[PDB]
Amino acid sequence: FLGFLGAAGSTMGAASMTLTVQARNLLSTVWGIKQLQARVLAVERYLRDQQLLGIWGCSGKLICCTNVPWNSSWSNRNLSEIWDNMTWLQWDKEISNYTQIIYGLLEESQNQQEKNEQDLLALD
Amino acid sequence: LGFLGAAGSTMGAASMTLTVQARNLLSGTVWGIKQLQARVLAVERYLRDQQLLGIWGCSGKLICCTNVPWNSSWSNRNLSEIWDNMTWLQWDKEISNYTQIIYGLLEESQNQQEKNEQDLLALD
Amino acid sequence: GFLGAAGSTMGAASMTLTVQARNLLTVWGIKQLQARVLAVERYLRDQQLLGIWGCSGKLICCTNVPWNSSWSNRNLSEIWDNMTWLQWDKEISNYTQIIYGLLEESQNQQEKNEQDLLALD
Amino acid sequence: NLWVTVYYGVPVWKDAETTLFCASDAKATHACVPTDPNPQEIHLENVTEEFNMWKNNMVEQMHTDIISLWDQSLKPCVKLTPLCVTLQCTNELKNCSFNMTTELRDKKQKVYSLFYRLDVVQININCNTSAITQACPKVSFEPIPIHYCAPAGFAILKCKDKKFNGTGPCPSVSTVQCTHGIKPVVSTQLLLNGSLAEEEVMIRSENITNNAKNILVQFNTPVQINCTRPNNNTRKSIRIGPGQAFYATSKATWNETLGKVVKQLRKHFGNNTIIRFANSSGGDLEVTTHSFNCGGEFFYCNTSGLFNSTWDSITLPCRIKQIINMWQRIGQAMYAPPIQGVIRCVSNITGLILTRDGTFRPGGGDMRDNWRSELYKYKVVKIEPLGVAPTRCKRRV
Amino acid sequence: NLWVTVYYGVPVWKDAETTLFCASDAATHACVPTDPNPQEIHLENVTEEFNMWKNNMVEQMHTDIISLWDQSLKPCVKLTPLCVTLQCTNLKNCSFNMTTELRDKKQKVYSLFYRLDVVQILINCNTSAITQACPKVSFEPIPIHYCAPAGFAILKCKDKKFNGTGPCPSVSTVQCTHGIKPVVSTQLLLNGSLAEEEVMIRSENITNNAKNILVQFNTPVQINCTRPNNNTRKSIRIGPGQAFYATAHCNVSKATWNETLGKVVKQLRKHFGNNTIIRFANSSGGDLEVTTHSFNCGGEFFYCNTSGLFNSTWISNSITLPCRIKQIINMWQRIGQAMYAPPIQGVIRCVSNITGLILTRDGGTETFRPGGGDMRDNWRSELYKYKVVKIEPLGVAPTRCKRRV
Amino acid sequence: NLWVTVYYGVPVWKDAETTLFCASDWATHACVPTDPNPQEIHLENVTEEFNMWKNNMVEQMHTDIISLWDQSLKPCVKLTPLQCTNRGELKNCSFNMTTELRDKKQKVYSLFYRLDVRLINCNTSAITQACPKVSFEPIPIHYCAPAGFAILKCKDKKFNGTGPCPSVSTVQCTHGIKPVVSTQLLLNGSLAEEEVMIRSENITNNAKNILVQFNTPVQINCTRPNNNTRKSIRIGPGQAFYATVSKATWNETLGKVVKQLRKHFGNNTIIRFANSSGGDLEVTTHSFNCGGEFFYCNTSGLFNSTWISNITLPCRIKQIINMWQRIGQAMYAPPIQGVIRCVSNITGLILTRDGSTTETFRPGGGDMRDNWRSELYKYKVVKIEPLGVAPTRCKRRV
Ligand SMILES: *[C@@H]1O[C@H](CO)[C@@H](O[C@@H]2O[C@H](CO)[C@@H](O[C@@H]3O[C@H](CO[C@H]4O[C@H](CO)[C@@H](O)[C@H](O)[C@@H]4O)[C@@H](O)[C@H](O[C@H]4O[C@H](CO)[C@@H](O)[C@H](O)[C@@H]4O[C@H]4O[C@H](CO)[C@@H](O)[C@H](O)[C@@H]4O)[C@@H]3O)[C@H](O)[C@H]2NC(C)=O)[C@H](O)[C@H]1NC(C)=O
Ligand SMILES: *[C@@H]1O[C@H](CO)[C@@H](O[C@@H]2O[C@H](CO)[C@@H](O[C@@H]3O[C@H](CO[C@H]4O[C@H](CO)[C@@H](O)[C@H](O)[C@@H]4O)[C@@H](O)[C@H](O[C@H]4O[C@H](CO)[C@@H](O)[C@H](O)[C@@H]4O)[C@@H]3O)[C@H](O)[C@H]2NC(C)=O)[C@H](O)[C@H]1NC(C)=O
Ligand SMILES: *[C@@H]1O[C@H](CO)[C@@H](O[C@@H]2O[C@H](CO)[C@@H](O[C@@H]3O[C@H](CO)[C@@H](O)[C@H](O)[C@@H]3O)[C@H](O)[C@H]2NC(C)=O)[C@H](O)[C@H]1NC(C)=O
Ligand SMILES: *[C@@H]1O[C@H](CO)[C@@H](O[C@@H]2O[C@H](CO)[C@@H](O[C@@H]3O[C@H](CO)[C@@H](O)[C@H](O)[C@@H]3O)[C@H](O)[C@H]2NC(C)=O)[C@H](O)[C@H]1NC(C)=O
Ligand SMILES: *[C@@H]1O[C@H](CO)[C@@H](O[C@@H]2O[C@H](CO)[C@@H](O)[C@H](O)[C@H]2NC(C)=O)[C@H](O)[C@H]1NC(C)=O
Ligand SMILES: *[C@@H]1O[C@H](CO)[C@@H](O[C@@H]2O[C@H](CO)[C@@H](O)[C@H](O)[C@H]2NC(C)=O)[C@H](O)[C@H]1NC(C)=O
Ligand SMILES: *[C@@H]1O[C@H](CO)[C@@H](O[C@@H]2O[C@H](CO)[C@@H](O)[C@H](O)[C@H]2NC(C)=O)[C@H](O)[C@H]1NC(C)=O
Ligand SMILES: *[C@@H]1O[C@H](CO)[C@@H](O)[C@H](O)[C@H]1NC(C)=O
Ligand SMILES: *[C@@H]1O[C@H](CO)[C@@H](O)[C@H](O)[C@H]1NC(C)=O
Ligand SMILES: *[C@@H]1O[C@H](CO)[C@@H](O)[C@H](O)[C@H]1NC(C)=O
Ligand SMILES: *[C@@H]1O[C@H](CO)[C@@H](O)[C@H](O)[C@H]1NC(C)=O
Ligand SMILES: *[C@@H]1O[C@H](CO)[C@@H](O)[C@H](O)[C@H]1NC(C)=O
């Protein structure tokens, strides 16, 4: 119970132990009209992230395994260099260039190609 | 080929580009209140569609297999005829009489009997 | 119909679950907007729990959290065949947030990380 | 060995108060959703829910709604500020003469009109209390049935009982999304066009024991009431410009009803002793009179001809007070522009508002009770569809 | 052995009307900035049928402009103390008494109004109350993009020449309609969309004379307007705080107009016959907002005769039309509301492109007079290519796959 | 052999500005009440850089106050229908006033101050009296961030508002921040722990104001000691016009300020304190509301000093105000029956500077946004970015 954003200064490997704490607190007459569009933005801010999580073969929360091979050009770092000597804030900075490449590769990467073959496979 | 790109193509070919209309299905003081109701309407029309996918055994996006048998009385046709010689706009009009029959059949014939089945089945 | 088995037994009530879930979703009119804005954050708040719990798509879902006897140690027949949900929610009411907290972490956290380990093989 | 299992959609509710929305029959009625051509009502077998019609939030949201929606009916209408002037009057009606502002600032205008005795007072009535705005002549004041409903995630339970005083356990309960379309009728002392009780008449009070607490009566047999404004009037629209313009000038059923009322009323008072009926003890003009709007015209009668008793039709004395400050709202006063031609009004009486001595008097005062003559059936609950319960089910990893 | 399958994101839409929002390039403060490059997706092998006459987008834009403009008069000074008897002489030099900053005193002041703003005993008091415009705000036109929210889309008829009705073979869809000019011009279209190939003629009913006839140019016609007098405005103090601001031919080329008209008469073509005479005539009469080419230029209202343009006869085989300022106006025929335009320091000169015409005709050779009346027609000269659709992404269809049990 | 994997809830946030809602334990009513025990989460090994000068919260708080205050004069009585003799701070002015009826008039005996007077309002703007039912009593306000966002708090005892913060925490809601409208002197603000600190957008530039935060609070009493009376003259219809510091503790504080000034101007230089040179009356004076009547008190008795290296103030009243330089809008304060007494804490100063070894310091004024900055220096809004992709050598089961 390290709290919301608790493991921010911790390594990536340790910060993935406390994932369910930043995810549950992700949705948490004039004048009052200024609190309404904050509520409204809060859900479109949340459905946008989960549509991706849906277009990607995940939906299932917190962690998700993929069939996208990580080409070296994205990082070229031993997982020990990443999980045990780096924070998520640092990592998001390194890959910032290739992130939207990965996002596009994910959806096409399996589900477009993965859900379709299950359709073929689930025929027999 | 972009949003609504395969509207004029055959059903078989239009299902390859499902993720382009699905990703652009949520699309990321008075007078400004007119733009607020719009994006409030945006989520409730999206959630109304996805509530069905929820009570159906889908959840996973774009394509989903089911166990509801396709009844002959509803659009009895050659598979090649349906997917290689028909557009979705044409198809949505022909099954139009039997759609909400299928919608209701889906929620009960498939998930309601399927998860209680698993509930009984996962006993040992 | 909606809320049909409210007076029925828990066992008979879980048959008709899909009826309460399908129906679960300029001034003056501003009062109707907050109603339908609350409606979705009222719905997603329930679906977030179903998400961090490993269910999400399921109306009934099974888990591997053992039912600790401290919570309503009663024979299974009593709970399903001799109680209504309104009576049950009152007895569990002390332990419900314990269950809720145990559901998210006690398995899914060690259960997702397990498959993450198992999927590396 | 047992394991928890999450169930979604379990029938579990708790009492709750929230914002409710509006419905407008078959179609402030501008954005109200049309009602389902057939609403749906679901009975709750083996269910007992307890009601407290006197501690119900629905009335206090309906009452806070009518007062505020009504004010909107006065915002695009002509303000009357230039009509607080010395009146030179002569002889219930009065032919008052007065100087009036024109379209131009400098020029003036002499005009005569026709006002009632209640709307005027001797100069040593509204100016004394508040400013005033005339109503828009384009809007209609016909009462229309209104359905109060609960949004998604909530529900309303209704007591499916023929005889119910509004409190205690309800054995036959149903739930609906929408209250039956309801008439927000503005009546004094006497209820008009309300919900008629099934089978025998009953009486309702927050506290019987406190005579200060009003005593609501709901008829079973309806009482027709005919009233009329029988003089063919004409109105001249004097130009208080620019643009703005001011528009200047059976007891056979009552005894059978009371006879049924005495018996039910006597049961609480006891079988041995007798009750007395008397006229209003006093207060504002709104309690003393059976004041309601009719044909677009506001209308008042002393009901002393009905309430004299110890246990062919009897007319009631009937006057008109053109200006009103309803709901004890000061600062806001409305002038009712009269209508061309003679008005005939026909409605039935459906209940009574009665007060008690330290004998029965016609009630008045707070309008919440009027809504409670309809909202006794209803209470709002919140839905809690998440359930965890043990079963023999296991999830595989 | 066939089974159903749910498909999500299927390309299916239906005609529908909903609330649309605004975008304003890079009342226009609440409009979200337009994407620096929008995206347009052609719909191959798609034929959609349009009915510009039954467009909802037009009647939403029009109701928008009306309710938008009323907001432009709320924080502005109300003129109520300006309904006073006017002592006038010949433009007219009128004198009048005035309320001062304090309640007691009065003030004599003289101003300068137009013959149309006044009547012998101002015209508005007879009709409605009045509010002057805020001098801080401006009425210059900015391109406005109407956009459809998520779950909806807007279809565009790509084809170079379109009547506004019937089947469109080349269709596309975008989130936002192009930069549409919200300009209220009367008789002649100003700064509008110029047709790609040949000028289009469009009317709700061609055979019916009573339905106004819209024309769309392909060659723009230049036009110069000017208020050539250096005015000075003096702010008399109708306090407290509030202050009233007390106090013209327009030109188009003829060499292009003869060239333009000849394309127009040939554009009529079959509709009235190849073998027929075509008549042009001045306005038959009506409201001052119909009889003249009314438009706002540089914050003042210029009400010009088109009588010089419209008299011609056409057999099968630098002219200038002047103007008088209109002063107060109740645009959109809205009564109870009235705006007085506060005059501006300096001389005004503005030049806009003419892009089309609004014309009415008489029933029986046929004659044509300048059109006017409702401003909805002005919007339909831009929204002819557009219509709104809902997106219905759920699809069920037979397949041969089965899920687990 | 490594593969992408999707993580949700990863602790990643970016600087951002957005609309914030309100939290309140009459303007405060309708503002969503506070949680009985908030949660504050420390961010270990985290160093976040703050820039109090480029904070959007202040300017969202400032724009909120201005636009919520005008709503406090909307349902109130308009004073558009509005001979004097006495020096005398007040003047007994008579005037003819309209009654309920347009024709009849009424003579009146009223008492206005020299500063409010024709009244000064007409030359500039229209005027509206405040509703006498609503109150201007300061009550703590919490500013909160909606879902998907968070607020970072610098848990440093001594912080000038810029640079890196080695101990950062996050909260959904700021602390109970006092919206106290005071000038020159900050009243009931946040008290700095231990040593007092000094903050200016640019230290080198004299024109930039210089905000001082006390650690030892300064008790201050002001009192309107005359028992006034209210006769509600009938300016109908319906509407009605309502007609009529320790020197022992201050030097201890100042003596800490010269040590607080420290090396910023040099140890050797002398520090002189002088009154404001002039400007608008809201700058020249420690203007604040107390008990509903607006106080203007001369602070020349506190700022007269020359500090080498090694207490009552006058007060006057204005019946009407145009706060925030807002013209077109003017509020008349209906006076209160009885004597007025207040006891507040002076919590900080706002100071300006002059253009050898001579340093002159004046009381502060200008934008009221600076005083909000005396509370919002510890805060900044961040946007939560919970989606992450990384390699973990797991592959999806097929
Ligand atoms: C907080 O407030 C302080 C003031 O209290 C303020 O500090 C001032 O900052 C400005 C710049 O931001 C400084 O102005 C610059 O000063 C340099 C150096 O000036 C000294 O040396 C020259 C030459 O000996 C003397 O004349 C002068 O009196 C000083 O002794 C100047 O060189 C700068 O001018 C150059 O750049 C300009 C660019 O626009 C040119 O227009 C100009 O012609 C000059 O160009 C020449 O020099 C360049 C190198 O500087 C060279 O690259 C060119 O090719 C060309 O040869 C400029 O005037 C000022 O001195 C500071 N004053 C103090 C007291 O500190 C802070 O900026 C403020 N903080 C913030 C955040 O705003
Ligand atoms: C609905 O309306 C009715 C009235 O119409 C209200 O009923 C009254 O309720 C109050 C209390 O809520 C009752 O007052 C209490 O009565 C007790 C018993 O009184 C009887 O016995 C004594 C002794 O023999 C006699 O003197 C008396 O005349 C009665 O015969 C008293 O014991 C109480 O006083 C005690 O408690 C107080 C506490 O403050 C002490 O100060 C006293 O010294 C003493 O110890 C008390 O007076 C009253 O009798 C009720 N009247 C009726 C007619 O029922 C209901 O309250 C109201 N409903 C609601 C919700 O308010
Ligand atoms: C009590 O309810 C009755 C309905 O049973 C109300 O009587 C109804 O009154 C309305 C208007 O007050 C009548 O509508 C009018 O009809 C005339 C004639 O067609 C038309 O010219 C008007 O434009 C308007 O539509 C309606 O006919 C009438 N119904 C009956 C059955 O008489 C009565 O007003 C209610 N009483 C109160 C106090 O609200
Ligand atoms: C149709 O489009 C023409 C453009 O060709 C518009 O003319 C332009 O009008 C704007 C304002 O209406 C002018 O901008 C102003 O310029 C003056 C002088 O430079 C300046 O003082 C103002 O601050 C503002 O910038 C612009 O110069 C002018 N351009 C031309 C070429 O005339 C015309 O207004 C449009 N017609 C209608 C009816 O909207
Ligand atoms: C789909 O339709 C085609 C016709 O378009 C069917 O083809 C016919 O098949 C029969 C025998 O199965 C032949 O005798 C005909 O000559 C064929 N006609 C053509 C035009 O090909 C085909 O059978 C249908 N597919 C299925 C699976 O039934
Ligand atoms: C402001 O007034 C308060 C009283 O309201 C003064 O506080 C008193 O201080 C004396 C000694 O200075 C104590 O004996 C009293 O017990 C205090 N009373 C209260 C209620 O605090 C305070 O000293 C005054 N401030 C100044 C600067 O004189
Ligand atoms: C600063 O806070 C003090 C309390 O420490 C406030 O003093 C209170 O003022 C109210 C009315 O303004 C009185 O009802 C209380 O009795 C006072 N309490 C004390 C202890 O003096 C003071 O008003 C605040 N200052 C400002 C400017 O809001
Ligand atoms: C990823 O690696 C592939 C080779 O497998 C290469 O084509 C591509 O350029 C790399 N990604 C980027 C962003 O360059
Ligand atoms: C096939 O569908 C029809 C409805 O179109 C339904 O009545 C019938 O029962 C279905 N077939 C069978 C075998 O049930
Ligand atoms: C009351 O009015 C009805 C018509 O609405 C009429 O038939 C009846 O005779 C009237 N009765 C009395 C007693 O006025
Ligand atoms: C009450 O009056 C209505 C007409 O408004 C009439 O139709 C109805 O029958 C009356 N009530 C009863 C119980 O008959
Ligand atoms: C009229 O305007 C045009 C631009 O459209 C300009 O070139 C021309 O100079 C103007 N007329 C005269 C006489 O200058």
**Domain residues of chain D, as ranges?**
12-18+36-53+149-179+377-384, 81-128+231-249, 186-230+250-366
Closest atom of ligand 9 to B98 CA is 5
**What residues of E are in contact with residue B77 (Cβ under 8 Å)?**
398
Q: Which chains contact D through at least 3 pairs of Cβ atoms less than 8 Å apart?
A: B, C, E, F
User: How many Å apart are CA F212 and CA F199, to the nearest integer?
Assistant: 7
Any atom of ligand 2 within 6 Å of the Cβ of D209: yes
Residue A71 near ligand 8, beta carbon < 6 Å: yes
Task: Domain ranges for chain B, please list them.
Answer: 1-124
What is the rounded distance in angstroms from the CA atom of residue D320 to the CA atom of residue D305? 18
| Ligand 12 geometric centre to CA of E224 (Å) | 7
| Strands D334-335 and B63-69, sheet pairing | unpaired
CA–CA gap between residue E118 and residue E384 (Å, rounded): 40
Angle between helices A33-55 and C30-52 (to 10 degrees): 40
At F348, is the secondary structure helix, strand, or coil? strand
Please, what sign has the CA dihedral across residues D236, D240, D243, D245? Answer: negative
Q: How far is CA D242 from CA D239, D246, E337, F5, in A?
A: 8, 11, 10, 72
Handedness of CA B74, B78, B80, B86 (dihedral sign): negative
Identify the bridge partners of residue E394 per DSSP, sorted by sequence position. E8
Give yes or no for residue F312 CB within 6 A of ligand 6. no
F165: closest CA of chain A, how far (Å): 13
Q: In this complex, how many residue pairs, one in chain B and one in chain D, have their CB atoms less than 8 Å apart?
A: 11
Residue pair F24/F141 in contact by the 8 Å Cβ criterion: yes
Cα E279 to averaged position of ligand 9 atoms, centre (Å): 68
- Cβ distance C51 to D384 under 8 Å? no
Whole-number Å distance between alpha carbons of D283 and F168: 66
**CA neighbor of E237 nearest in space, from F83, F113, F118, F319:** F118
Q: Rounded to an integer, what distance in angstroms lies between the CA atom of residue F254 and that of residue E169?
A: 83
**D150 vs A104, D156, D179, D383, F74, CA distance in Å?**
43, 7, 9, 11, 33
E and D touch per CB criterion (3+ pairs under 8 A): yes
Give the gap in angstroms from C-alpha A85 to the nearest C-alpha of chain B: 34
Chain D positions contacting chain F at CB under 8 Å are: 81-82, 84-86, 99, 101, 126-132, 330-331, 333
Distance in Å, alpha carbon of E237 to nearest chain F alpha carbon: 9
H or E segment and range at residue F358: strand F358-363
Query: What pairing do the DSSP bridges indicate for beta strands E278-280 and E366-370?
Result: parallel
Question: Taking CB atoms and an 8 Å cutoff, what residues of chain F touch D129?
Answer: 238
Q: How close is the nearest chain C Cα to the Cα of A59, in Å?
A: 8
The answer to whether the beta carbons of residues D201 and D260 sit under 8 Å apart is yes
Q: Which of C20, C34, C56 is nearest to D44 (CA)?
A: C20
Ligand 9 in reach of B73 Cβ (< 6 A): yes
> What is the distance, to the nearest Å, from the Cα of residue E218 to the centroid of all Cα atoms in its chain?
19
Residue F369's SS3 state is helix
The Cα E135–Cα E132 span in angstroms is 9
User: Tokens 């397990």 map to which residue?
Assistant: C114
Whether E219 contacts E356, CB under 8 Å = no
Place of tokens 């645009």: E331
Q: How far does the centroid of ligand 3 lie from the alpha carbon of residue D294, in Å?
A: 9
Q: Which atom of ligand 7 is nearest to the CA of F181?
A: 27
CA of C90 to the centre of ligand 9 (A): 44
Q: Which H, E and C letters describe chain E, residue by residue?
A: CCEEEEEECCCCEEECCCCCEEECCCCCCCCECCCCCCCCEEECCCCEEEEHHHCHHHHHHHHHHHHHHHHCCCCCCECHHHCCCCECCCCEEEEEEEECCCCCCEEEEEEEECCCCCCCCCHHHHHCCCEECCCCCCCCCCCEEEECCCCEEEEEECCCCCCCEEEECCEEEECECCCECCCCECCEEECCCCCCCCCEEEECCCCCCCCCEEEEEEEEEEEEEEECCCCCCEEECCCCCCCEEECCCEEECCHHHHHHHHHHHHHHHHHCCCCCCEEECCCCCCCHHHHCEEEEECCEEEEECCHHHHCEEECCCCCEECEEECCCECHHHCCCCCEECCCCCCCEEEEEEEEEEEEEECCCCEEEEECCCCCHHHHHCCHHHEEEEEECCEEEEEECCCCCC
Q: What single DSSP character describes residue C16?
A: G
**Rounded-to-integer distance, Cα B81 and Cα E36, Å:** 44
Residue D360 forms beta bridges with which residues? Answer: D277, D356
Which residues form ligand 11's pocket by a CB distance below 6 Å? D 196, 222, 348
Spatial separation of the C-alpha atoms in residues E124 and E84, rounded to whole Å:
12
Specify whether the CB–CB gap between E401 and A122 falls below 8 A. yes
Question: Residue A73 class from Cβ within 10 Å (0-12 exposed, 13-18 middle, 19+ buried)?
Answer: exposed
**Tokens coding E83:** 């309904």
Cβ of E299 below 6 Å from ligand 4: no
Chain F residues with CB under 8 Å of A31 CB are 30-31, 68, 71
Where residue F188 falls (left for φ over 0; alpha for ψ -120 to 50; beta otherwise) is left
What own/partner pairs with CB < 8 Å and gap ≥ 24 does D315-318 have? D316/D227, D316/D290, D318/D227
Interchain contact, A123 vs E403, CB within 8 Å: no
Strand partners, F106: F97
Other Cβ atoms less than 10 A from the Cβ of F158: the count is 12
In 3D, which of B51, B124, D391 has the Cα closest to residue C60?
Answer: D391
Say yes or no: CB of residue D226 within 6 Å of ligand 10. Answer: yes
Kindly give the distance from the C-alpha atom of residue D355 to the centroid of ligand 2, in angstroms, as a whole number: 22
**Which residue in chain E is spatially nearest to D241 when comparing CA positions?**
E125
**What is the C-alpha separation between E96 and B17, in angstroms, rounded?**
74
Ligand nearest to C-alpha D253: 10
C-alpha E298 to ligand 4 mean position (Å): 7
Q: How far apart are CA E153 and CA B4, in angstroms?
A: 9
Say which ligand is closest to the CA of D198.
11
Which helix (H) or strand (E) is F204 found in, with range?
none
| Residues contacting ligand 7 via CB (< 6 Å) | F 137-138, 180, 182, 187-188, 288, 290-291, 342-345
Atom number of ligand 6 nearest to Cα F245? 27
Pairing of strands D378-383, D360-362: unpaired
Quote the CA–CA distance of E320 and F255 in Å, as a whole number. 82
Q: What tokens appear for F48 in the block?
A: 């976040």
Way the structure was solved: X-ray
Contact D388 C34 (CB under 8 A): no
Q: What is the spatial distance between Cα F342 and Cα F146, in angstroms, rounded to a whole number?
A: 37
Residue whose CA lies nearest to ligand 10 atom number 2: D226
Q: Phi and psi (nearest 5°) for F176? A: -65, 95
| Breaks in chain C after (C-N > 2.5 angstroms) | 25
How far apart (Å, rounded) are the C-alpha atoms in residues B33 and E321? Answer: 44
Neighbours of chain E (3+ CB pairs under 8 A): A, B, D, F
Structure tokens at D57: 């939030």
Residues 6+ positions from D292 with CB-CB distance below 8 Å: D185, D186, D187, D188, D192, D298, D299
